[PDB]
Amino acid sequence: LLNIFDIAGSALAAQSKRLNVAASNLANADSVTGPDGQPYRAKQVVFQVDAAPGQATGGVKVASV
């Protein structure tokens, strides 16, 4: 059941990443500029299945933001 530990840890990391993205978006609801002068474009995480050696079922990994 150590693979279950891998699954649960990966999923905790993914949900923490989503929560952080949402918090950063909520902070920047009214932001007008960044460092370069470009507008702040809202971020969204992409979830993907982490089952590379585990057939079609596995943990969830954040592919990109």
């Binding site: 007008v32 500029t33 370069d36 002068g37």
Partner: protein
């Protein structure tokens, strides 16, 4: 910072205070009271 974009920089005020209240020394109008003891001044002058 050293400078397109908007000049960054947090500068916060404090409030409002009253400094001094000034009086407008402009000639008022004259009203007729037949009492001979009353006098009005045409110009900038004060009785001591």
């Amino acid at each position: 910072g050293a400078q397109t974009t908007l000049p960054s920089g947090l500068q916060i005020g404090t409030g409002v205070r009253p400094v001094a209240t000034e009086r407008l020394h402009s000639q008022g109008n004259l009203s007729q009271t037949n009492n001979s003891k009353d006098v009005a001044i045409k110009g900038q002058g004060f009785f001591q």
